[PDB]
Amino acid sequence: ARIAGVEIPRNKRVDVALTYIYGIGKARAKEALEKTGINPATRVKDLTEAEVVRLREYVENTWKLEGELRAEVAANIKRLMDIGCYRGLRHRRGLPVRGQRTRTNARTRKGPRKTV
Amino acid sequence: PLDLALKRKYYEEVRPELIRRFGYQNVWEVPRLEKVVINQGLGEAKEDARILEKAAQELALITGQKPAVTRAKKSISNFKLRKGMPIGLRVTLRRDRMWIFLEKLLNVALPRIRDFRGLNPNSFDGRGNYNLGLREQLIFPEITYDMVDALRGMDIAVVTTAETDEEARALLELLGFPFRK
Amino acid sequence: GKGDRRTRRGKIWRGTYGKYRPR
Amino acid sequence: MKEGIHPKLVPARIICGCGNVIETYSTKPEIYVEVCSKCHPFYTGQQRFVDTEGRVERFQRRYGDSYRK
Amino acid sequence: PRSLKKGVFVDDHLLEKVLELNAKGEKRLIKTWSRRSTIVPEMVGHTIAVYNGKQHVPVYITENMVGHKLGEFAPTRTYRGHG
Amino acid sequence: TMNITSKQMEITPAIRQHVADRLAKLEKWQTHLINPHIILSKEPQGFVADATINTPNGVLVASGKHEDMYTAINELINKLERQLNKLQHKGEARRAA
RNA sequence: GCGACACACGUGCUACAAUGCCCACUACAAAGCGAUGCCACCCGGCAACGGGGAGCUAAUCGCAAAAAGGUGGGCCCAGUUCGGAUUGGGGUCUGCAACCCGACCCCAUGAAGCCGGAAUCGCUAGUAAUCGCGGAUCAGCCAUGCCGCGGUGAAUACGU
RNA sequence: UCCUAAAAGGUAACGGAGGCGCCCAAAGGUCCCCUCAGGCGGGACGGAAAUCCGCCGGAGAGCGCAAGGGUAGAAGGGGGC
Ligand SMILES: [Mg+2]
Ligand SMILES: [Mg+2]
Ligand SMILES: [Mg+2]
Ligand SMILES: [Mg+2]
Ligand SMILES: [Mg+2]
Ligand SMILES: [Mg+2]
Ligand SMILES: [Mg+2]
Ligand SMILES: [Mg+2]
Ligand SMILES: [Mg+2]
Ligand SMILES: [Mg+2]
Ligand SMILES: [Mg+2]
Ligand SMILES: [Mg+2]
Ligand SMILES: [Mg+2]
Ligand SMILES: [Mg+2]
Ligand SMILES: [Mg+2]
Ligand SMILES: [Mg+2]
Ligand SMILES: [Mg+2]
Ligand SMILES: [Mg+2]
Ligand SMILES: [Mg+2]
Ligand SMILES: [Mg+2]
Ligand SMILES: [Mg+2]
Ligand SMILES: [Mg+2]
Ligand SMILES: [Mg+2]
Ligand SMILES: [Mg+2]
Ligand SMILES: [Mg+2]
Ligand SMILES: [Mg+2]
Ligand SMILES: [Mg+2]
Ligand SMILES: [Mg+2]
Ligand SMILES: [Mg+2]
Ligand SMILES: [Mg+2]
Ligand SMILES: [Mg+2]
Ligand SMILES: [Mg+2]
Ligand SMILES: [Mg+2]
Ligand SMILES: [Mg+2]
Ligand SMILES: [Mg+2]
Ligand SMILES: [Mg+2]
Ligand SMILES: [Mg+2]
Ligand SMILES: [Mg+2]
Ligand SMILES: [Mg+2]
Ligand SMILES: [Mg+2]
Ligand SMILES: [Mg+2]
Ligand SMILES: [Mg+2]
Ligand SMILES: [Zn+2]
């Protein structure tokens, strides 16, 4: 688990393998490769260990990643379900939160269909 | 015996701090480290590929000591367990090897743990011994991501000559054990 | 692709502009 | 000990990413690691990597104090 | 959400009853039809009855529920499930 | 599955089951009934029961009218049975020459 | 409240990828709409947008960019640089007011889905398929709808 | 094998309860080494119960199999020849 607590896929480009980190999309990928001046097309299996610790230190010290990101999102839902707001109720029962239709579809929040 | 940073740190900085903090009358009365037994509970290699020599090889690389096998004292239905079936590993580390492994554990292993927030303070025996667990073996430096096939944690039991959990926690935290509370 | 908000093709489908489809 | 069954322990250099070198003994004389106890956030005081925020919710809004009173 | 260029919206007539209770001393129960009004820090501690089309649900305002609206805590649908 | 519709009327889940049990008579032929839709209503004369079912060998359309609600359901089943019994045997007629 | 959600049916949108996805550059339409309207152009911002401000009762000026396509570069068969659902946080605008219950922008999350059972729909030439644009209603918009417009442009008909 | 059986042995009933018609090539000989069940506490997946550590624990475990007797100062667990 080199960076940043997970292992990034080698033989892939660094701007791509960095997305395999819970908290880094294509945006924060092109960001960490300019702040360190590291060629985004170069493969992970071809990185310099000097370029590793530089990209490591910048990424791990700029955005919350991995378990620390999962804690606040869980805590943000935790307070939503504790205060008792309408969005908290949708998380407690498990229904959609963002004004979506529930008569049909809505299958991602409910899961596969339950026959009756 | 070999000259080690952790054993020297014990004899130099941990002994007098302990004697001062507790007021021991005799040199032997001070808490000392007795042994460190590591045990891979395994049991996943009952049937299937019972060839667990990859795990024993990993333990022999991490500790520098070849482990021994542990088998079942009885047959168990629900666990799919026949009596006398090899189900685990156990290596007993003492003296210089104990110091070496504890050095590498405190300086490299415990840091590299995913979402590490310290060692559980209430994990003490009551008699003055400590225990902990590990979810992976990639935590140790001698184990890389290539030579591994499956994730397998382990149990670590540190046995101390201390009599209370107080003196034991003193000795262990002084030696550098990071406690979350 | 036409449903992906973070792409050129996706904002043509929607009819809006942004960083991925400037004007 | 039993000869021929134990990997030999030899003087070992354990190099960390932050530049920390550790003189020890192991089966591989050189081992590089991503993190060590001298640079982990939980060890080095309270080096909260990115998030030393302060929650910051909820009274930390204060945008703004313009409603009449 | 509402624009930062515009202000934090309270129905004025509701904020009046808030400040009148902060001077002489909190608190007395307030009935309101202001689901649109945003909770303000000066509302923390009081007990506001929010109307949900039928009932006036008593809702105690705390420290963690300041950035929300009053209508989020007096829901409008009685739903116990199916079956 | 099976769908029932009460047009400008109000029926109970008990009555909805009776319609489901009367449609078991079509299961006799051991052929696939594809989304049998049932429509009930109230004329001035009496109740009316419609049904539009698809089978792998065609579709079934019928109508039953009677003063008694369940009796119109019966007539609908009688007329559905007949159509079903024809769609499963009309091919067997011209096997020779 | 008409926006409910143990479920069921119809119509659609977007997909399951290399005859493809993404980035940069560059060509070719028609029909409409536009005076607290359409906004050129400048500037702030990653952006939505905001602040300036010329023109146009409009074959004059504006919406406006057409998209597929063309050129170049990347991706290399993976639940992936396919797919963009769901959720966390931060903003913009309309509007008295976006909690229930608006659209949009941005960071993060990155699901089902590997071409679909029984059954069934459309289409005979500029047609199907695929690609984009405008308008009514309209403060805004849940429009993937409807009514129109063109771009590329097939297969097949022995026979009843 | 136990009870009935009346503290030596023996003792009947269509009296009360159970087992046998096998097995083991080590489950045999010998030398050397080791000590249980259980309870409490601690320990990744791991649980009432898998394996690990500590403390208490004379035998309640074990001894192929019914029952009784015997048994760790071994008849129990392991190895050598
Ligand atoms: Mg990521
Ligand atoms: Mg000494
Ligand atoms: Mg304790
Ligand atoms: Mg002790
Ligand atoms: Mg390692
Ligand atoms: Mg397409
Ligand atoms: Mg995508
Ligand atoms: Mg020797
Ligand atoms: Mg029905
Ligand atoms: Mg009804
Ligand atoms: Mg009705
Ligand atoms: Mg009819
Ligand atoms: Mg009949
Ligand atoms: Mg309403
Ligand atoms: Mg809704
Ligand atoms: Mg149903
Ligand atoms: Mg269906
Ligand atoms: Mg649609
Ligand atoms: Mg594929
Ligand atoms: Mg995935
Ligand atoms: Mg799948
Ligand atoms: Mg993807
Ligand atoms: Mg296709
Ligand atoms: Mg078919
Ligand atoms: Mg025709
Ligand atoms: Mg349109
Ligand atoms: Mg218009
Ligand atoms: Mg409009
Ligand atoms: Mg919506
Ligand atoms: Mg006797
Ligand atoms: Mg006797
Ligand atoms: Mg006798
Ligand atoms: Mg005798
Ligand atoms: Mg033997
Ligand atoms: Mg024997
Ligand atoms: Mg025990
Ligand atoms: Mg557990
Ligand atoms: Mg346990
Ligand atoms: Mg016994
Ligand atoms: Mg023996
Ligand atoms: Mg022997
Ligand atoms: Mg011999
Ligand atoms: Zn370090």
Side-chain angles (χ1 to χ4, degrees), chain A residues 1-5 7-29 31-44 46-56 58-116, chain B residues 1-46 48-49 51-52 55-72 74 76-81 83-111 113-116 118-145 147-180, chain C, chain D residues 1-37 39-47 49-50 52-54 56-69, chain E residues 1-11 13-23 25 27 29-83, chain F residues 1-66 68-97:
Chain A
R2 43 182 79 182
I3 55 178
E7 189 76 45
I8 56 174
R10 315 166 70 262
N11 317 343
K12 274 184 164 298
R13 290 174 46 163
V14 297
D15 53 349
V16 189
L18 265 45
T19 56
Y20 291 84
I21 304 174
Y22 189 87
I24 302 171
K26 293 187 69 66
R28 296 178 175 182
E31 165 79 357
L33 298 171
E34 300 162 4
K35 292 294 179 298
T36 60
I38 302 177
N39 187 19
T42 50
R43 304 297 182 165
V44 175
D46 300 349
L47 288 179
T48 305
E49 190 64 26
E51 291 182 324
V52 171
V53 294
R54 297 194 296 106
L55 211 160
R56 178 179 295 160
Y58 178 79
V59 163
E60 304 192 0
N61 298 261
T62 42
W63 314 282
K64 314 176 70 170
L65 290 185
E66 295 287 353
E68 192 165 18
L69 224 181
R70 308 174 183 267
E72 181 175 3
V73 179
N76 288 334
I77 299 183
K78 183 57 172 61
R79 61 168 294 267
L80 275 181
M81 298 189 301
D82 289 326
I83 61 173
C85 106
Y86 187 94
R87 302 166 46 191
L89 290 168
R90 305 297 275 181
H91 287 97
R92 300 205 300 183
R93 185 178 270 93
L95 292 176
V97 193
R98 301 187 172 184
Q100 291 122 344
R101 187 187 181 99
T102 57
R103 185 171 195 172
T104 62
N105 302 331
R107 277 301 140 185
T108 303
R109 294 288 292 178
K110 301 159 69 73
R113 305 182 182 180
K114 302 172 299 304
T115 69
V116 167
Chain B
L2 294 174
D3 190 10
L4 287 166
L6 233 192
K7 187 167 65 176
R8 175 181 296 273
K9 180 184 180 177
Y10 174 73
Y11 278 83
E12 285 185 0
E13 311 172 10
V14 182
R15 293 287 300 255
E17 174 71 19
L18 278 169
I19 304 176
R20 154 197 171 279
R21 191 170 292 182
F22 292 99
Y24 296 102
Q25 303 295 318
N26 193 307
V27 282
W28 297 100
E29 202 169 10
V30 313
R32 315 181 303 273
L33 286 189
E34 194 174 17
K35 67 176 185 179
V36 174
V37 169
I38 310 166
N39 161 83
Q40 272 191 343
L42 254 43
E44 312 162 358
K46 34 188 173 188
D48 283 318
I51 32 189
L52 41 71
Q57 176 76 24
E58 292 167 355
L59 293 183
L61 289 180
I62 301 170
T63 68
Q65 205 172 294
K66 201 197 74 62
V69 201
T70 59
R71 308 190 184 189
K74 68 192 183 74
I76 290 188
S77 311
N78 308 89
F79 296 164
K80 310 183 185 69
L81 230 195
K83 176 198 180 67
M85 185 170 289
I87 56 174
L89 307 179
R90 174 199 73 192
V91 53
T92 303
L93 296 182
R94 310 170 194 249
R95 292 171 175 259
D96 293 337
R97 290 188 295 278
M98 171 188 58
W99 293 113
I100 292 164
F101 172 76
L102 277 178
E103 189 178 11
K104 292 174 301 194
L105 167 72
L106 296 183
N107 283 260
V108 167
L110 304 181
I113 297 190
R114 174 180 321 279
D115 308 318
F116 177 85
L119 300 163
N120 190 19
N122 305 272
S123 294
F124 279 97
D125 198 10
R127 299 293 185 169
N129 312 286
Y130 192 81
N131 303 83
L132 52 88
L134 298 85
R135 296 182 296 101
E136 312 175 14
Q137 71 272 27
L138 305 170
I139 301 180
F140 301 97
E142 294 94 342
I143 301 304
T144 73
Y145 190 80
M147 50 186 303
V148 65
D149 58 346
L151 296 181
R152 45 174 80 106
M154 70 188 60
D155 309 324
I156 300 186
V158 40
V159 178
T160 302
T161 60
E163 294 179 354
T164 69
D165 291 356
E166 184 183 7
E167 315 165 14
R169 180 163 197 273
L171 170 53
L172 292 190
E173 188 170 3
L174 269 42
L175 283 172
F177 289 25
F179 289 85
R180 78 165 62 99
Chain C
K2 291 178 284 295
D4 192 0
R5 286 174 177 80
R6 296 188 187 179
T7 49
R8 165 180 186 259
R9 183 57 49 181
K11 295 182 176 296
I12 304 172
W13 190 97
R14 285 293 171 80
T16 55
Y17 302 88
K19 172 176 62 181
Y20 305 95
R21 182 174 180 258
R23 59 171 165 181
Chain D
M1 302 176 63
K2 285 195 171 191
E3 294 170 337
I5 79 176
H6 302 296
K8 180 168 70 179
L9 293 175
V10 294
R13 293 289 197 94
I14 295 197
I15 316 297
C16 177
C18 73
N20 188 15
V21 181
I22 299 172
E23 307 272 356
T24 173
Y25 290 81
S26 175
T27 60
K28 310 178 180 64
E30 279 90 22
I31 298 179
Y32 297 86
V33 294
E34 65 271 285
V35 66
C36 87
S37 53
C39 75
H40 190 276
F42 172 66
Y43 287 90
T44 63
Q46 296 82 358
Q47 183 196 349
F49 265 164
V50 39
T52 327
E53 39 193 9
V56 295
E57 60 180 350
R58 169 60 58 175
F59 288 164
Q60 211 63 39
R61 30 171 252 93
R62 305 303 173 176
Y63 318 127
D65 199 81
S66 301
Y67 40 94
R68 204 57 44 194
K69 70 158 52 182
Chain E
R2 194 187 164 94
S3 297
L4 281 184
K5 187 173 62 178
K6 313 177 75 176
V8 173
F9 183 79
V10 187
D11 275 325
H13 70 71
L14 175 59
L15 183 59
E16 176 187 9
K17 301 180 183 179
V18 178
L19 304 167
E20 294 170 346
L21 280 185
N22 295 337
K27 42 253 173 178
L29 197 55
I30 294 186
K31 291 178 174 294
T32 190
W33 293 257
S34 302
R35 308 182 65 85
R36 49 166 81 178
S37 300
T38 319
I39 289 110
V40 112
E42 282 71 4
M43 301 181 177
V44 178
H46 297 70
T47 52
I48 301 177
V50 182
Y51 190 67
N52 53 19
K54 171 191 176 184
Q55 298 278 335
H56 286 274
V57 175
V59 176
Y60 174 72
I61 298 92
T62 66
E63 177 172 7
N64 49 25
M65 53 174 67
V66 186
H68 305 252
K69 305 294 186 72
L70 285 176
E72 298 181 7
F73 306 87
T76 47
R77 298 198 168 98
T78 311
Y79 173 79
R80 310 172 181 89
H82 286 261
Chain F
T1 63
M2 180 214 58
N3 304 276
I4 310 176
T5 291
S6 182
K7 179 176 182 173
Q8 293 176 338
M9 289 189 314
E10 195 62 28
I11 58 175
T12 64
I15 296 184
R16 300 185 175 275
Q17 181 65 27
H18 177 252
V19 176
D21 293 333
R22 281 300 181 176
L23 270 186
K25 301 183 72 176
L26 299 185
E27 311 194 1
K28 184 193 310 171
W29 280 258
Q30 306 181 18
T31 191
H32 186 186
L33 301 178
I34 301 182
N35 300 317
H37 191 195
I38 313 299
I39 292 89
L40 295 82
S41 24
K42 182 67 185 66
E43 275 183 357
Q45 316 307 105
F47 297 89
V48 181
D50 277 329
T52 80
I53 315 169
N54 184 26
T55 71
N57 301 348
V59 300
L60 305 162
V61 185
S63 167
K65 294 191 180 63
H66 192 262
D68 189 8
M69 171 176 57
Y70 310 98
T71 301
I73 300 169
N74 287 344
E75 270 188 24
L76 184 67
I77 293 303
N78 256 282
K79 303 185 183 191
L80 282 180
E81 281 179 324
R82 187 166 189 186
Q83 289 193 20
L84 177 53
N85 195 23
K86 188 204 304 171
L87 297 181
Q88 309 291 332
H89 292 303
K90 182 168 183 174
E92 316 176 8
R94 299 299 175 90
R95 276 177 177 170

PDB file of all heavy atoms in Angstrom, chain D residues 1 5 8 10 12 17 25 29 36 38 50 64 66, unseen atoms left out:
ATOM      1  N   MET D   1      20.587 -23.069  18.173  1.00  0.00           N
ATOM      2  CA  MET D   1      19.307 -23.420  17.564  1.00  0.00           C
ATOM      3  C   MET D   1      19.440 -24.612  16.615  1.00  0.00           C
ATOM      4  O   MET D   1      20.531 -25.154  16.438  1.00  0.00           O
ATOM      5  CB  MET D   1      18.730 -22.222  16.813  1.00  0.00           C
ATOM      6  CG  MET D   1      18.521 -20.999  17.676  1.00  0.00           C
ATOM      7  SD  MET D   1      17.949 -19.577  16.731  1.00  0.00           S
ATOM      8  CE  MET D   1      16.370 -20.164  16.133  1.00  0.00           C
ATOM      9  N   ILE D   5      17.216 -24.795   9.307  1.00  0.00           N
ATOM     10  CA  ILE D   5      15.778 -24.578   9.198  1.00  0.00           C
ATOM     11  C   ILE D   5      15.380 -23.134   9.453  1.00  0.00           C
ATOM     12  O   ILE D   5      14.203 -22.795   9.297  1.00  0.00           O
ATOM     13  CB  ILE D   5      14.996 -25.513  10.143  1.00  0.00           C
ATOM     14  CG1 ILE D   5      15.028 -24.972  11.571  1.00  0.00           C
ATOM     15  CG2 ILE D   5      15.579 -26.915  10.113  1.00  0.00           C
ATOM     16  CD1 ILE D   5      14.213 -25.786  12.546  1.00  0.00           C
ATOM     17  N   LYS D   8      18.801 -16.950   8.214  1.00  0.00           N
ATOM     18  CA  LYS D   8      19.864 -16.326   8.992  1.00  0.00           C
ATOM     19  C   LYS D   8      19.607 -14.835   9.181  1.00  0.00           C
ATOM     20  O   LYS D   8      19.270 -14.122   8.231  1.00  0.00           O
ATOM     21  CB  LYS D   8      21.218 -16.543   8.316  1.00  0.00           C
ATOM     22  CG  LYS D   8      22.383 -15.912   9.066  1.00  0.00           C
ATOM     23  CD  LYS D   8      23.726 -16.393   8.541  1.00  0.00           C
ATOM     24  CE  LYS D   8      24.019 -15.849   7.156  1.00  0.00           C
ATOM     25  NZ  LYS D   8      25.350 -16.304   6.669  1.00  0.00           N
ATOM     26  N   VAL D  10      20.964 -11.161   9.723  1.00  0.00           N
ATOM     27  CA  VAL D  10      22.176 -10.421   9.378  1.00  0.00           C
ATOM     28  C   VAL D  10      21.920  -8.941   9.629  1.00  0.00           C
ATOM     29  O   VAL D  10      20.760  -8.502   9.711  1.00  0.00           O
ATOM     30  CB  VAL D  10      22.606 -10.683   7.915  1.00  0.00           C
ATOM     31  CG1 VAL D  10      23.035 -12.134   7.742  1.00  0.00           C
ATOM     32  CG2 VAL D  10      21.480 -10.337   6.953  1.00  0.00           C
ATOM     33  N   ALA D  12      20.989  -5.307   9.201  1.00  0.00           N
ATOM     34  CA  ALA D  12      19.991  -4.827   8.257  1.00  0.00           C
ATOM     35  C   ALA D  12      19.829  -3.316   8.345  1.00  0.00           C
ATOM     36  O   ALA D  12      19.809  -2.741   9.442  1.00  0.00           O
ATOM     37  CB  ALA D  12      18.638  -5.506   8.502  1.00  0.00           C
ATOM     38  N   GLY D  17      10.785   6.516   4.376  1.00  0.00           N
ATOM     39  CA  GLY D  17      10.556   7.522   3.354  1.00  0.00           C
ATOM     40  C   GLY D  17      10.942   8.923   3.788  1.00  0.00           C
ATOM     41  O   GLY D  17      11.407   9.725   2.971  1.00  0.00           O
ATOM     42  N   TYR D  25      18.571  -5.938  12.577  1.00  0.00           N
ATOM     43  CA  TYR D  25      18.960  -7.248  12.075  1.00  0.00           C
ATOM     44  C   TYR D  25      17.735  -7.900  11.457  1.00  0.00           C
ATOM     45  O   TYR D  25      16.649  -7.860  12.043  1.00  0.00           O
ATOM     46  CB  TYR D  25      19.530  -8.130  13.195  1.00  0.00           C
ATOM     47  CG  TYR D  25      20.890  -7.697  13.707  1.00  0.00           C
ATOM     48  CD1 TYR D  25      21.014  -6.660  14.625  1.00  0.00           C
ATOM     49  CD2 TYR D  25      22.048  -8.337  13.283  1.00  0.00           C
ATOM     50  CE1 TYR D  25      22.256  -6.262  15.095  1.00  0.00           C
ATOM     51  CE2 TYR D  25      23.294  -7.948  13.749  1.00  0.00           C
ATOM     52  CZ  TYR D  25      23.392  -6.911  14.654  1.00  0.00           C
ATOM     53  OH  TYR D  25      24.630  -6.523  15.118  1.00  0.00           O
ATOM     54  N   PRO D  29      19.052  -7.680   4.085  1.00  0.00           N
ATOM     55  CA  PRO D  29      19.929  -6.643   4.660  1.00  0.00           C
ATOM     56  C   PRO D  29      19.501  -5.213   4.365  1.00  0.00           C
ATOM     57  O   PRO D  29      19.953  -4.298   5.065  1.00  0.00           O
ATOM     58  CB  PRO D  29      21.294  -6.958   4.032  1.00  0.00           C
ATOM     59  CG  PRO D  29      21.219  -8.406   3.671  1.00  0.00           C
ATOM     60  CD  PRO D  29      19.797  -8.632   3.248  1.00  0.00           C
ATOM     61  N   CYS D  36       7.523   5.172   9.007  1.00  0.00           N
ATOM     62  CA  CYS D  36       8.144   4.655  10.219  1.00  0.00           C
ATOM     63  C   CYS D  36       7.564   5.389  11.421  1.00  0.00           C
ATOM     64  O   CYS D  36       6.782   6.337  11.284  1.00  0.00           O
ATOM     65  CB  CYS D  36       9.671   4.791  10.176  1.00  0.00           C
ATOM     66  SG  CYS D  36      10.301   6.380  10.764  1.00  0.00           S
ATOM     67  N   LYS D  38       8.974   7.376  13.402  1.00  0.00           N
ATOM     68  CA  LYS D  38       9.478   8.731  13.556  1.00  0.00           C
ATOM     69  C   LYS D  38       8.779   9.729  12.644  1.00  0.00           C
ATOM     70  O   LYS D  38       9.130  10.914  12.660  1.00  0.00           O
ATOM     71  CB  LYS D  38      10.988   8.763  13.303  1.00  0.00           C
ATOM     72  N   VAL D  50      -4.008  16.335   6.908  1.00  0.00           N
ATOM     73  CA  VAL D  50      -4.789  17.330   6.192  1.00  0.00           C
ATOM     74  C   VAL D  50      -5.829  17.985   7.092  1.00  0.00           C
ATOM     75  O   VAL D  50      -5.989  19.206   7.073  1.00  0.00           O
ATOM     76  CB  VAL D  50      -5.446  16.684   4.953  1.00  0.00           C
ATOM     77  CG1 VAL D  50      -5.930  15.276   5.284  1.00  0.00           C
ATOM     78  CG2 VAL D  50      -6.593  17.544   4.448  1.00  0.00           C
ATOM     79  N   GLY D  64     -24.304  35.438   7.063  1.00  0.00           N
ATOM     80  CA  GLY D  64     -23.543  36.312   7.939  1.00  0.00           C
ATOM     81  C   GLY D  64     -24.385  36.838   9.087  1.00  0.00           C
ATOM     82  O   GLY D  64     -25.453  36.295   9.375  1.00  0.00           O
ATOM     83  N   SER D  66     -26.182  39.607   9.302  1.00  0.00           N
ATOM     84  CA  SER D  66     -26.874  40.718   8.666  1.00  0.00           C
ATOM     85  C   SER D  66     -28.377  40.736   8.912  1.00  0.00           C
ATOM     86  O   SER D  66     -29.027  41.731   8.569  1.00  0.00           O
ATOM     87  CB  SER D  66     -26.613  40.704   7.151  1.00  0.00           C
ATOM     88  OG  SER D  66     -25.226  40.793   6.867  1.00  0.00           O
TER      89      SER D  66
END
